[PDB]
Amino acid sequence: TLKSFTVEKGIYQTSNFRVQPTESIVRFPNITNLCPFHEVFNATTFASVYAWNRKRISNCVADYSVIYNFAPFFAFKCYGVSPTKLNDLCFTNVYADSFVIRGNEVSQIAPGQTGNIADYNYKLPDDFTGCVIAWNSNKLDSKPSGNYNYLYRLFRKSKLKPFERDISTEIYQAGNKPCNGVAGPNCYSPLQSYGFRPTYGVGHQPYRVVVLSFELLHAPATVCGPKKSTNLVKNKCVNFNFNGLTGTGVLTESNKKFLPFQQFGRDIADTTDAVRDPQTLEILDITPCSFGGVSVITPGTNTSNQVAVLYQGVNCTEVPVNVFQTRAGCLIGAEYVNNSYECDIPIGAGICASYQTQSQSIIAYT
Amino acid sequence: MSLGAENSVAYSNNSIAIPTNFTISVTTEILPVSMTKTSVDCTMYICGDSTECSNLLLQYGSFCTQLKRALTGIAVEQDKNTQEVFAQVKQIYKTPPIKYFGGFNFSQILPDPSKPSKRSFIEDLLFNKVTLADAGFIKQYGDCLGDIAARDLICAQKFNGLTVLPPLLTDEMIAQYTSALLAGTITSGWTFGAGAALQIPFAMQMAYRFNGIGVTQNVLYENQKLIANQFNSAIGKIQDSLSSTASALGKLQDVVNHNAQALNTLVKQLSSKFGAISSVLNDILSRLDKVEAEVQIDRLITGRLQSLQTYVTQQLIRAAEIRASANLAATKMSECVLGQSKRVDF
Amino acid sequence: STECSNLLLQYGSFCTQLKRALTGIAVEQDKNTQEVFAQVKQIYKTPPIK
Amino acid sequence: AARDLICAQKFNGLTVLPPLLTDEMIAQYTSALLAGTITSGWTFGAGAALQIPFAMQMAYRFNGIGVTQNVLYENQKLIANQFNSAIGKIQDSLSSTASALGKLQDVVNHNAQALNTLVKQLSSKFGAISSVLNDILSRLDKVEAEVQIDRLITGRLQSLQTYVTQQLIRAAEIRASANLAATKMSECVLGQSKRVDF
Amino acid sequence: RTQSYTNSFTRGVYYPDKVFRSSVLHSTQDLFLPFFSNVTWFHAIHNPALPFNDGVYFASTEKSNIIRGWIFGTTLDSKTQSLLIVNNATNVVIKVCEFQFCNDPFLDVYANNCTFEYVSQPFLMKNLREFVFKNIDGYFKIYSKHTPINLERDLPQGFSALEPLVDLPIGINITRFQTLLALHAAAYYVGYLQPRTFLLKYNENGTITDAVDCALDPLSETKC
Ligand SMILES: *[C@@H]1O[C@H](CO)[C@@H](O)[C@H](O)[C@H]1NC(C)=O
Ligand SMILES: *[C@@H]1O[C@H](CO)[C@@H](O)[C@H](O)[C@H]1NC(C)=O
Ligand SMILES: *[C@@H]1O[C@H](CO)[C@@H](O)[C@H](O)[C@H]1NC(C)=O
Ligand SMILES: *[C@@H]1O[C@H](CO)[C@@H](O)[C@H](O)[C@H]1NC(C)=O
Ligand SMILES: *[C@@H]1O[C@H](CO)[C@@H](O)[C@H](O)[C@H]1NC(C)=O
Ligand SMILES: *[C@@H]1O[C@H](CO)[C@@H](O)[C@H](O)[C@H]1NC(C)=O
Ligand SMILES: *[C@@H]1O[C@H](CO)[C@@H](O)[C@H](O)[C@H]1NC(C)=O
3-state secondary structure labels for all residues of chain A:
CCCCCCCCCEEEEEEEEECCCCCEEEECCCCCCECCCHHHHCCCCCCCCCCCEEEEECCEECCHHHHHHHCCCCCEEECCCCHHHCCCCCECCEEEEEEEEECCCCCCCCCCCCCCHHHHCCCCCCCCCEEEEEEECCCCCCCCCCECCCEEECCCCCCCCCCCCCCCCCCEECCCCCCCCCCCCCEECCEEECCECCCCCHHHCEEEEEEEEECCCCCCCCECCCCCCCCCCCCCEEEEEECCEEEEEEEEECCCCCCCCCCEEECCCCCEEEEECCCCCCEEEEECCCEEEEEEEECCCCCCCCCEEEEECCCCCCCCCCEEECCCEEEECCEECCCCCCCCEECCCCCEEEEECCCCEEEEEC
Side chain identity, residue A187? C
Across chain E, where does the E strand assignment appear? 2-7, 19-20, 25-32, 38-44, 50-51, 56-60, 70-73, 84-85, 94-95, 128-136, 139-147, 163-168, 176-179, 186-192, 194-202, 208-213
Q: Can you give the three-state secondary structure of chain D, one letter per residue?
A: CCCCHHHHHHHCCCCCCCCCCCHHHHHHHHHHHHHHHHHHCCHHHCCCCCCCCHHHHHHHHHHHCCCCCHHHHCCHHHHHHHHHHHHHHHHHHHHHCCCCCHHHHHHHHHHHHHHHHHHHHHHCCCCCCCCCHHHHHHHCCHHHHHHHHHHHHHHHHHHHHHHHHHHHHHHHHHHHHHHHHHHHHHHHHCCCCCCCCC
CB neighbours of B284 closer than 8 A, spacing ≥ 6? B276, B277, B278, B293, B296, B297, B300
Tell me, yes or no, if D143 comes closer than 8 A to chain A by beta carbon.
Answer: yes
> Residue A180: left (phi > 0), alpha (psi -120 to 50), or beta?
left
Helix (H) or strand (E) holding B326: helix B290-332
Helix (H) or strand (E) holding B163: strand B162-165
Residue nearest to atom 4 of ligand 6 (CA): E5
Side chain identity, residue A279? Q
Residue nearest to atom 8 of ligand 5 (CA): B107
Tell me, yes or no, if D141 comes closer than 8 A to chain A by beta carbon.
Answer: yes
CB distance B35 to B78 below 8 Å: yes
Question: Residue A15: CA atoms inside 13 Å, Cβ hemisphere, count?
Answer: 4
A68-A69-A71 Cα angle (round to 5): 70
Residue B143 pairs in a beta bridge with none
CB neighbours of A149 closer than 8 A, spacing ≥ 6? A45, A48
A259/E206 Cβ within 8 A = yes
Cα–Cα distances (Å) from B91 to B155, B176, B195, B304, in that order, read 42, 11, 11, 49
CA–CA gap between residue B176 and residue B87 (Å, rounded): 10
CA–CA gap between residue E38 and residue E155 (Å, rounded): 12
CA–CA gap between residue D72 and residue D76 (Å, rounded): 5
Are chains A and B touching, using the cut-off of 8 Å on CB pairs and a minimum of 3 such pairs?
yes
Q: Estimate to the nearest angstrom the gap between the alpha carbon of A253 and the chain centroid.
A: 26
CA–CA gap between residue E92 and residue E71 (Å, rounded): 14
CA–CA gap between residue E134 and residue E144 (Å, rounded): 12
Helices D142-184, C14-37: inter-axial angle, 10-degree rounding: 20
User: What is the pairing mode between strands A335-336 and E56-60?
Assistant: unpaired
> Residue A181: left (phi > 0), alpha (psi -120 to 50), or beta?
left
Which residue among B4, B16, B343 places its CB closest to the CB of D52? B16
CA–CA gap between residue B86 and residue B84 (Å, rounded): 6
CB distance B74 to B315 below 8 Å: yes
Tell me, yes or no, if A85 comes closer than 8 A to chain B by beta carbon.
Answer: yes
CB distance D154 to C7 below 8 Å: no
CA–CA gap between residue A131 and residue A108 (Å, rounded): 14
| Neighbour-count burial for B91-111, b at 16+ CB within 10 Å, e otherwise | eebebeeeeebbebbbebbbb
Question: Residue A125: CA atoms inside 13 Å, Cβ hemisphere, count?
Answer: 15
Side chain identity, residue B18? I
Rg (CA), chain D: 28
Number of other residues whose CB lies within 10 A of the CB of residue B87: 13
CA-based nearest residue to E96, from E106, E107, E111: E111
Q: Which residues of A touch E169 (CB under 8 A)?
A: 56, 93
- E partners (3+ CB pairs within 8 A) are A, B
Residue nearest to atom 9 of ligand 1 (CA): A30
For an interface test with B, the pick among A268, A286, A316 (most B C-beta atoms closer than 10 Å) comes out as A268
C47/B269 Cβ within 8 A = no
**DSSP single-letter state for residue E102:** -
CA-based nearest residue to A218, from A254, A264, A179, A171: A264
CA–CA gap between residue D60 and residue E161 (Å, rounded): 79
Pocket test for ligand 6, best of E6, E35, E38, E192 (most atoms within 8 A of CB): E38
CB distance E176 to E49 below 8 Å: yes
Are chains E and A touching, using the cut-off of 8 Å on CB pairs and a minimum of 3 such pairs?
yes
Question: Residue B55: CA atoms inside 13 Å, Cβ hemisphere, count?
Answer: 6
**DSSP single-letter state for residue B248:** T
Residue E201 pairs in a beta bridge with E25, E210
Q: Is B302 helix (H, G, I), strand (E, B) or coil?
A: helix
Helix (H) or strand (E) holding B236: helix B224-244
CB neighbours of A286 closer than 8 A, spacing ≥ 6? A240, A247, A249, A250, A251, A272, A273, A274, A275
B238-B241-B246 Cα angle (round to 5): 130
**DSSP single-letter state for residue B45:** I
Q: Is E210 helix (H, G, I), strand (E, B) or coil?
A: strand
CA–CA gap between residue B72 and residue A24 (Å, rounded): 38
Q: Is E208 helix (H, G, I), strand (E, B) or coil?
A: strand
Cα–Cα distances (Å) from B209 to B99, B184, B235, B280, B336, in that order, read 21, 16, 19, 68, 12
Tell me, yes or no, if D40 comes closer than 8 A to chain B by beta carbon.
Answer: yes
Helix (H) or strand (E) holding B37: strand B37-40
Q: Is the CB of A339 under 6 A from ligand 3?
A: no
CA–CA gap between residue D54 and residue A296 (Å, rounded): 70
For an interface test with B, the pick among D52, D60, D159 (most B C-beta atoms closer than 10 Å) comes out as D52
Summary count for chain B: helices (H), strands (E) = 13, 3
CB distance A151 to A48 below 8 Å: yes
Are chains C and A touching, using the cut-off of 8 Å on CB pairs and a minimum of 3 such pairs?
no
Length of chain C: 50
CA–CA gap between residue E33 and residue E215 (Å, rounded): 12
C18/D31 Cβ within 8 A = no
- Residue B294 distance to chain D (closest CA, Å): 17
Residue E181 pairs in a beta bridge with none
CA–CA gap between residue A80 and residue A132 (Å, rounded): 11
Residue B224: φ, ψ to 5°? -75, -45
Residue E65: φ, ψ to 5°? 60, 65
CA–CA gap between residue B217 and residue D160 (Å, rounded): 63
Tell me, yes or no, if C7 comes closer than 8 A to chain B by beta carbon.
Answer: yes
Number of other residues whose CB lies within 10 A of the CB of residue B79: 16
Cα–ligand 2 centroid distance for A68 (angstroms): 14
CB neighbours of E13 closer than 8 A, spacing ≥ 6? E32, E33, E159, E160, E161, E162, E198, E200, E208, E211
Residue B216, judged by CB atoms within 10 A of its CB (0-12, 13-18, 19+), counts as exposed
Residue nearest to atom 2 of ligand 4 (CA): B13
Q: Which ligand minimizes its atom distance to the CA of A66?
A: 2
CB neighbours of C24 closer than 8 A, spacing ≥ 6? none
- Residue A85 distance to chain B (closest CA, Å): 6
CA-based nearest residue to B279, from B268, B289, B290: B268
CA-based nearest residue to C22, from D108, D14, D105: D14
Tell me, yes or no, if C29 comes closer than 8 A to chain D by beta carbon.
Answer: yes
| Neighbour-count burial for E157-189, b at 16+ CB within 10 Å, e otherwise | eeebbbbbbbebebbbebebbbbbbbeeebbbb
Number of other residues whose CB lies within 10 A of the CB of residue B330: 18
Tell me, yes or no, if E167 comes closer than 8 A to chain A by beta carbon.
Answer: yes
Q: Estimate to the nearest angstrom the gap between the alpha carbon of A107 and the chain centroid.
A: 26
CB distance A101 to A139 below 8 Å: no
Cα–ligand 1 centroid distance for E205 (angstroms): 29
Number of other residues whose CB lies within 10 A of the CB of residue B28: 11
Q: Which ligand minimizes its atom distance to the CA of D54?
A: 4
Q: Estimate to the nearest angstrom the gap between the alpha carbon of E67 and the chain centroid.
A: 13
CB distance A96 to A212 below 8 Å: yes
Cα–Cα distances (Å) from E157 to A164, C50, D45, E11, E215, in that order, read 39, 73, 60, 8, 20
CA–CA gap between residue E57 and residue E131 (Å, rounded): 6
CA–CA gap between residue B117 and residue E173 (Å, rounded): 74
**Chain B CA closest to residue E202:** B150
Which atom of ligand 1 is nearest the CA belonging to A280?
Answer: 4
CA–CA gap between residue E143 and residue E166 (Å, rounded): 8
Helix (H) or strand (E) holding B165: strand B162-165
CA-based nearest residue to A304, from A4, A2, A7: A7
In chain A, which residues are followed by a C-to-N distance beyond 2.5 Å, i.e. a gap? 321, 358
Length of chain A: 366
CA-based nearest residue to A156, from A138, A173, A135, A179: A173
Q: Is B125 helix (H, G, I), strand (E, B) or coil?
A: helix
Q: Is E3 helix (H, G, I), strand (E, B) or coil?
A: strand
- D partners (3+ CB pairs within 8 A) are A, B, C
- Residue E162 distance to chain A (closest CA, Å): 12
